[PDB]
Design a protein around this ligand. Structure first.
Ligand code: MG
Lengths: 91, 223, 100, 136, 108
């Protein structure tokens, strides 16, 4: 039994004709319905898990930390850049 | 049991230099890193004149003997806090050294905030971080001024929360609210790298010492 | 152990005297486009422009020659109680130093 | 409940007082450390004030005795054509050698500044240093 | 904070000029808190409703607790004379049994 069968079974057992599908009955996995950004960020002793916890954007700044370190090694160490075409930056 | 916990936490405070931080630095070592170079006389703060050896043709020079005494106190304080498993947060707004300071904090095992500091981060932490957020036990200010030449907001806000602050203070900085001021050069890359190394070696030694102290006392309980 | 007072008296920076129109050797540590950030042993680095001649030669780590003007660029403006500093030194890039 | 008053007292005094009143039941972990190894100065707020009238700072201009000789060398010959290297901790510039020889002659007992200035130039000329008396 | 008591010192009902009512309503409340054992503080709370101004001031003052030194727990250590802006206060140390002979706000 899979997510596809579950959604089909719920539609048979609880027929709803509401036009908006967010308002219809749902038996989904908690990961989908519940906001993902609500996870504990520190332990029992109160010490945060990530060294950038106190910035308030630990994941944005952890990513900007990695990309800035890569840039420094490439600049220190020292062709066409269009390895990929028909692509866009993620929104 | 109770005796062992008392030994782990009370014995370190009975020695003047339990972690032997004196060896890490020397007046000669500080002079190599250009830690005695200050801003021009025009940029001088009135509360920094005690620490200034003199004015060498317009450039204030920082007495490296006062720096050695003050740095000894600051490094010793930073070690006992790390020994007791306290949280240490490195703070700076100099963008040249943002990556170095974040790399240092990660190496030590501590925390860094080198980005824009949000108003209320410390005085309104529960709203920003959550109900039970544990605030830092020590804030180390590698730079005490922001990029508009004003005191970093966390200097006043750390006093409001009664958090001790170990800060590097230069001739234009205001050391009055810094708990453990370390007079020295903050602009030169060689000076900042020396300070970052000292705080990282000091913190790593204290954390290792705590592990060893716990193993010795713990082993005695069965033995 | 030598004292700080002795170290300062015999320091290369103390020997230089005034830094106006002096010659010093610098090292390029950071390059952004045609702007070279050069450390000449002082508190603040300088920022020069890549010369048209032998532009490719000025890479990171390359030692160069400079003519200092100020160790720190600072000036007080009307209505200010302290000097305004740009946290930078002033120098004129003369060219590469011969390795010899 | 705390004392967010950073203009009266210090973090240590405010923490000491809050415990005496009865509001803070547990010592902070940094407290005992501060008690045993306090800073040289107490961290209390002070409002920076300006100096008025005839009040002046207490900063000694750093001028060694070699500077009298160095000033003459720069005025007569300018800066040595060799470039200063401020990265070598033991660098000896053309001017610093001039001041070392000028001192040696002065130890012998020569009392005339003019004698010491022209004799030093001759000694360095024998060494082979190229001193140009550039008035321009 | 059951050991702390709160007292009111001033309550102003001030009206400004905002489009919501043309002339908006405002309540500014000054309160003081203390445990009667040396720790005390004061704060100002402002709101549109008086009850809210009480809560804001009352909980703000608990974050600004001064500690006042009492000689033998009943009086000040020495005479105190000061001028805060245009208001002069002149306090005097007194023996036991003298009581509080002061401005009604100072007694509180
Ligand atoms: Mg500086």
């Amino acid at each position: 039994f899979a997510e596809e069968d579950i959604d089909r079974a719920i539609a048979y057992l609880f027929p709803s004709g509401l036009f908006e599908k967010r308002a219809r009955p749902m038996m989904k996995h908690p990961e989908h319905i519940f906001p993902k950004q609500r996870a504990t960020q520190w332990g029992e002793d109160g010490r945060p898990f990530h060294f950038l916890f106190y910035t308030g954007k630990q994941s944005y700044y952890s990513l900007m930390h990695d990309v800035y370190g890569k840039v420094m090694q490439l600049e220190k160490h020292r062709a066409e850049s269009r390895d990929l075409i028909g692509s866009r930056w993620l929104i | 049991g109770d005796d062992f916990q008392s030994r782990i936490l009370d014995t370190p405070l009975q020695h003047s230099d339990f972690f032997n931080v004196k060896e890490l630095f020397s007046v000669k070592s500080l002079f190599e890193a250009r830690v005695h170079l200050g801003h021009k006389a025009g940029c001088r703060h009135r509360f920094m004149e005690p620490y200034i050896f003199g004015n060498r043709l317009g450039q204030d020079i920082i007495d490296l003997d006062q720096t050695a005494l003050n740095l000894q106190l600051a490094l010793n304080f930073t070690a006992h806090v790390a020994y007791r498993k306290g949280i240490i947060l490195f703070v700076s707004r100099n963008r040249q050294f943002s990556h170095l300071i974040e790399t240092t904090a990660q190496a030590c095992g501590e925390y860094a905030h080198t980005r824009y500091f949000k108003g209320g981060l410390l005085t309104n932490a529960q709203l920003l971080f959550g109900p039970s957020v544990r605030l830092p036990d020590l804030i180390i200010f590698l730079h005490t001024l922001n990029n508009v030449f004003e005191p970093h907001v966390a200097v006043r806000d750390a006093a409001k929360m009664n958090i001790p602050t170990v800060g590097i203070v230069d001739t234009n900085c205001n050391p009055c609210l810094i708990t453990y001021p370390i007079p020295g050069n903050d602009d030169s890359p060689q000076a900042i790298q020396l300070f970052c190394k000292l705080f990282r070696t000091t913190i790593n030694r204290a954390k290792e010492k705590r592990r060893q102290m716990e193993a010795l006392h713990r082993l005695q309980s069965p033995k | 152990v030598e004292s700080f007072a002795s170290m300062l008296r015999h320091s290369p920076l103390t020997q230089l005297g005034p830094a106006k129109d002096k010659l010093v050797i610098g090292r390029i540590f950071h390059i952004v486009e045609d702007d070279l950030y050069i450390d000449f042993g002082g508190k603040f680095h300088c920022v020069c422009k890549r010369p048209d001649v032998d532009g490719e030669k000025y890479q990171r780590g390359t030692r160069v020659r400079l003519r200092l003007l100020d160790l720190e660029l600072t000036s007080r403006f009307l209505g200010g109680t302290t000097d305004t500093t740009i946290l930078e030194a002033d120098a004129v890039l003369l060219g590469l130093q011969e390795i010899r | 409940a705390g004392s967010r008053l950073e203009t009266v007292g210090s973090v240590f005094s405010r923490t000491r007082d809050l415990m005496r009143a009865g509001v803070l039941k547990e010592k902070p972990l940094w407290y005992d450390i501060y008690k045993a190894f306090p800073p040289l100065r107490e961290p209390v707020f002070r409002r920076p004030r300006l100096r008025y009238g005839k009040a002046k700072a207490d900063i000694q201009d750093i001028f060694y005795q070699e500077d009298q000789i160095r000033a003459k060398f720069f005025a007569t010959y300018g800066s040595g054509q060799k470039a200063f290297d401020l990265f070598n901790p033991n660098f000896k510039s053309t001017c610093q050698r001039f001041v070392e020889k000028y001192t040696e002659l002065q130890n012998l007992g020569e009392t005339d500044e003019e004698k010491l200035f022209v004799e030093t130039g001759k000694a360095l000329l024998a060494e082979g240093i190229i001193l140009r008396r550039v008035r321009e | 904070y059951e050991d702390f008591d709160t007292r009111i010192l001033e309550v102003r009902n001030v009206f400004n000029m905002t489009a919501k009512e043309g002339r908006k309503k405002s309540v500014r409340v000054l309160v003081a808190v203390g445990n009667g054992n040396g720790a005390a503080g004061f704060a100002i709370g402002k709101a549109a409703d008086r009850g809210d101004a009480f809560r804001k001031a009352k909980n703000r003052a608990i974050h600004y607790l001064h500690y006042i030194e009492r000689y033998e727990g009943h009086t000040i250590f020495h005479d105190i004379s000061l001028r805060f802006k245009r208001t002069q206060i002149r306090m005097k140390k007194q023996p036991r049994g003298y009581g509080l002979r002061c401005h009604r706000a100072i007694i509180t």
